Structure formats: structure tokens, C-alpha cells
Ligand binder design. Structure first.
Ligand SMILES: CCCCCCCCCCC[C@@H](O)CC(=O)N[C@H]1[C@@H](OP(=O)(O)O)O[C@H](CO)[C@@H](O)[C@@H]1OC(=O)C[C@H](O)CCCCCCCCCCC
Lengths: 171, 171, 171, 171
């Protein structure tokens, strides 16, 4: 209901996203945020991360047959947030119980033995705070690791350990 | 433990800043924002921009003898904001009349004949939105171009025309 | 030696509960039962207790912003049990230590200056025997008063005095 | 450059507190203040009020097995503030979401149909101003009633009505 700008998000067109065919909406405010890792290549420049977002969406859309990249937002090691399905569209990232009731954000990389740099972590958390400001997320949203809702190594041991320390984390 | 503050700002230690010796505090909520360009080299990756921030500060501190880089914040073409003097400390970027009453943000590069990429412009807006949320800048803050308050070409013809289109800009 | 059937419980749909957003599961057989009072208005008819359960849930969901009414079950003075989060879902009634290991049942009304009627006490006892029969509760489950595990007057002096006499109460 | 600022809080030692065993810290400046009532009896002389602080602490530590009395501060009707976990240690007064991000002040008494006397309201307001002066609370901290964040009658209808008029109150 409120107006103002918040965070910086690389818009779909900027990373050359194929148009989205998704139409199923999320009911705001969303209560849950599920953090995953793509378990794909990482990137650390805006040019390489735009390409990585395009690659992940390519895989989801072209190979998995989904209506769009599965994540609502992707986070690059360049410290930028990449617009996925966005705040209003149900994503495909955490199974049928979780997809309809959460926002999925994914760090582009494999964090089993590596951590995302502080800039990626800041972008992620700042994105969530913007979500709250926009009324897209509940002021009391809860952040979970992908492994807290599905059997998976995601978001990677190292990254999971870090999100466990976030303010809104509730396993 | 505790949430990283808004604006996804690269902290001064992250860009290896020399310690500041500045002491003068700004009285918040600050009314003005002055946008400048560094008229120096630009950079388009976190690694090159952290180095550029370091270079700009080195010049101000080592050569000009200042207590810190003069800008409150620097904006890189990597789409990230670099912490300079910050929200609370008076900068040295717009002269004696403006320094005490504004936050000076400087785009790293020379914008006389080229524009900052959208990600750099987005980073600048994210930052200002964050200053308002923080209480650092008043809600109805006013943006001024550096040339509007000191005799200079900064922030560069091309960046100057863009800022003139900002809702908070005031001639 | 095989699964039977108990439970004279009023289904959520019947009391027109808002849908639950809770998903964390309790581990059966649950060892503990925490008895609280809603400290609010009591009701002595199915029509009024269905609305009272709705009001209590409204407070938790609408005002406190929770995923569901915090209790696993609510007990009315009409002698009926109202389905809250139920046997399988972690409630929100006794804090972080006790919620994961207990079923929280709450008597609807204030039992500081009142005892619940015999029919409400029978409802509660019958519910717990049902939980043991279903394997939801350990056969030797321990009953705690809310005030024994959190700082509160709950479940009210009168009710507290009553539960301290129960076979299953464990100081 | 003046050492003494605000304060005049009855130190633990003085109300004869059992040594705290809590070590989890809050991060200053703290954004939220949650006002509760102890829900029991009041005290209106320094002698009585100090006995009560001991009593509340006794319940939390001896009975509930807590590391210290749960509140950061207690307000006596004797017009004095009683030191609890203090400005820096995470309390146990508003649940797992609020505890790590707020300062819990509890008026010693039950204010459902009795309002705290002016000297207790002054004590409380002065402590908060003190908090801000010290950097312990943010200048724009928000006050919430206990019942705004937890299912409880605390801080009492009478005291709740009064705090909703406070400058910093925000439901
Ligand atoms: C610490 C001791 C406090 C003393 C308690 C005194 C007794 C009176 C209150 C009843 C306690 C009961 O609520 C306990 C409870 O259920 N706790 C939290 C939690 O338990 P878990 O086991 O951790 O899941 O279960 C849930 C998960 O984490 C959660 O619901 C519970 O408490 C919370 O964390 C939720 C917050 O209390 C409410 C959050 C939003 C409040 C709405 C305020 C709106 C203002 C807007 C703010 C921007």
C-alpha cells in the first residue's frame, strides 16, 4: 500500500531474461523465505552474473519446462540481486508444500565448501528488508534453508551455517 | 546476530580503506544530497571498484592531506555503493556552504561524455532510500548536482542531465 | 494391538477457522501437555464457543501475525474441544523450549476467579486419553501448568489448583 | 565528555539479586521496547519494591530455571527503576522473536484495573530517555505493549491504554 523505492535489483530485461509465462500469484504478505543455492557456477561481475542468471533460467525453462526461472530472486557474488519471478509470483524452488507460501531466493553457486562473499549476503538480506517494506513479506517473516524443507544439501553447508545466524531464521 | 543496514554498502574495511581521522558530525536528518563524479577512472567489478575507492581515498588522504576520502559515499559501475565518510560524518566534497548540510555521493568515473550504467544509478537510489529509512536524510531530501553548488563540471554533463530528472532533484 | 478411534473434537472448518500457515511438526509420541487459559471471555454453547475460538485465533493470526491460533486444542465451557493446531503441528503456547515437545491445550475464559465447569474438565481429560489412544501422546505423558514453564498467571489459580491433582501432573 | 548521564537505577546488588548467569547479548542501539506488567502485586515503597524484584527473579530463576529474571528492567510504584538483565543482555520477556531485538520493561504489579502512579510512569519514561541518551536504544525506538507481541493480558488494560499514547508507541 506504501510507495517508496528499496534495494537495487537487476531487472529481468537487463539480464536478458526470456519472458515469463507464470501467472499463479502468491498471497501477500508472504510468511516464508527459503534460501537455496543453485549448486551451479558462481560469478563475480555484473556481466558474468547476468549471464549466470540467464543460464539458470534457460535450464529451468528450456529443460525443466517451467514457466520461468524457478526462483523469485537470485543473488550473485557480484553483490547484485537478479529479479526472478519477483515478489508476486509463486516460484518453483522448494516443493509443492513450500512453493505456494514462500519467496525463494537462490545464491548462484555451490556453497558446500565456499561461502558467498559478504556483498552477496548483504544484498540478500537487504532484499528481504525491501520485501517487508513493500508488504510482499510479513514483518515477521521466517527464513529457512532449503534443507529445512526438503532433503537436499542446498543451500550448501557453509551458506546454511551463515543463514542460521540471520535475524529471521527459524529452522 | 544483527541485520546489515540498508543500501548494500561495501564497508570501508572491505575496500581496505585507510582509517578515517574525520570527526565532524552532520546534523541529521540531512536536507541535501550533492551528486558528483570523481572525474577519475571508472571500474565495473567489485574487485576493481574496491581498488578504485582505495585509489580515490589515497589521493585525498595522502596527497590532499584530508582526514578521509571526501565523499560520504562512492558509486561504482559494478552497481555497488562504497562507504566513504558515511551518513554521520561531514564530508569534503561540495565546499564550505554545502559540506555541513548534505551527503555527498560520487560516481566513480568521468561522466562528461558517458553515463553510469543503470546499475550504478539504481545503487545511488537504493542508497538514498536507505538514508531516509535510517533517519540520516529527511524524507523530502533535495538532490543537487555538484555544479549547482560549486563552479565545476562535476558530476559530468551526461550524469548531470540524468540527475536533473530525479524526483528529489531541485534546481 | 491396532488403530482405533476416539476424538469428539470440533473440526477447524466447523468453527470456521482461518487456514493455518503453520508447518513445523511435533514428534509423536509427545511427552508433555501444557495447560493454559486464554485469560479471556468464556463461552458455554457451541455457537458461542465456535465464535470464541474464532476470536482467539483472530487475535493470534491477525494481531500477533502468527501462522495459526497458538494452541493445539482449545477447551470450551460448552464441554466441547476445538481443533487448534492439532496433534501433529507444533504450537505456539509455551515458549521455545516447550513448544517442540508439548501439546498445548487452552481453556477458553479466565480461571483466576473461576473453575471451568465439569464438562470442560471432562472434555480435556477425554482429549488427553484420546491422544494416548492415538499414539499422539506418551501413555505416561506429563501435564504442566503454563505457569510452571513460562512467567504467567495462566492457566489461572483455580484451574492450576485442579491440574496439580491430576494423575499425569508432574510438578 | 561528562561521565554521568541519566541513570538512577537501583542496582542488582542493592535489591539483592542472585548473580545472573545470562550471556547472550543484545545489539545496541536497540529498536524496540516491550512493556509488560508482572501481573502480581505491586510495591510502593523502596523497601517493598526491592523485595518484589527479588521475588520475581526467584520465580524466573528458581522455578523456571532461567539464567536471570527475564526483564531488562522493572518499574516499582515507589517511582524507582530496578535493574534486571539491563541494557545489554537479551531478556526473556516477549518470546523468541522479540527478545533478541528489544528491551523488556515490566511494571511491578497488575494493571488490568489499576493504573501505575505518576512516579512509576515517570520512572519508565526517564529510563527510556536514558536509554536513548546512552546509545542503548535508537532515537526512534518503538514501544509495543506485551499483548501486541505475545498472547497475554500484559501489560494490563489500564497500562496498555497509557502506553498507546506515548510518543514512541507503534502497535
Ligand atoms: C520468552 C519468554 C516470554 C514470556 C511468555 C509469557 C507467556 C505469555 C505469552 C505466551 C507464550 C507463547 O507465545 C510462546 C510461543 O509460542 N513462543 C514462540 C515460538 O516457540 P518455538 O518453540 O520457538 O516455536 O513459537 C512461534 C515461533 O517462533 C512464535 O509464534 C512464538 O513467539 C514468537 O516468536 C512470535 C512473536 O511473539 C510475535 C511476532 C509478531 C508480533 C506482532 C507485533 C506487530 C508489530 C509489528 C512489528 C513490525
Amino acid at each position: 500500500e506504501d510507495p517508496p523505492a528499496c534495494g537495487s535489483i537487476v531487472p529481468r530485461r537487463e539480464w536478458r531474461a526470456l519472458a515469463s509465462e507464470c501467472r499463479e500469484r502468491l498471497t501477500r504478505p508472504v510468511r516464508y523465505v527459503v534460501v537455496s543455492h543453485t549448486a551451479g557456477s558462481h560469478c563475480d561481475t555484473p556481466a558474468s552474473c547476468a549471464q549466470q542468471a540467464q543460464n539458470v533460467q534457460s535450464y529451468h525453462v528450456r529443460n525443466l519446462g517451467w514457466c520461468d526461472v524457478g526462483y523469485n530472486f537470485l543473488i550473485g557474488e557480484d553483490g547484485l540481486v537478479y529479479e526472478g519471478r519477483g515478489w508476486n509470483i509463486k516460484g518453483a524452488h522448494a516443493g509443492p508444500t513450500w512453493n505456494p507460501i514462500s519467496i525463494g531466493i537462490s545464491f548462484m553457486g555451490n556453497y558446500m565448501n565456499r561461502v558467498p562473499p559478504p556483498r552477496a549476503l548483504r544484498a540478500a538480506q537487504n532484499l528481504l528488508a525491501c520485501g517487508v517494506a513493500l508488504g510482499a513479506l510479513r514483518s515477521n517473516y521466517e527464513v529457512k534453508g532449503h534443507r529445512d524443507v526438503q532433503p537436499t544439501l542446498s543451500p550448501g553447508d557453509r551458506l546454511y551455517e551463515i543463514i542460521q545466524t540471520w535475524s529471521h531464521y527459524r529452522a
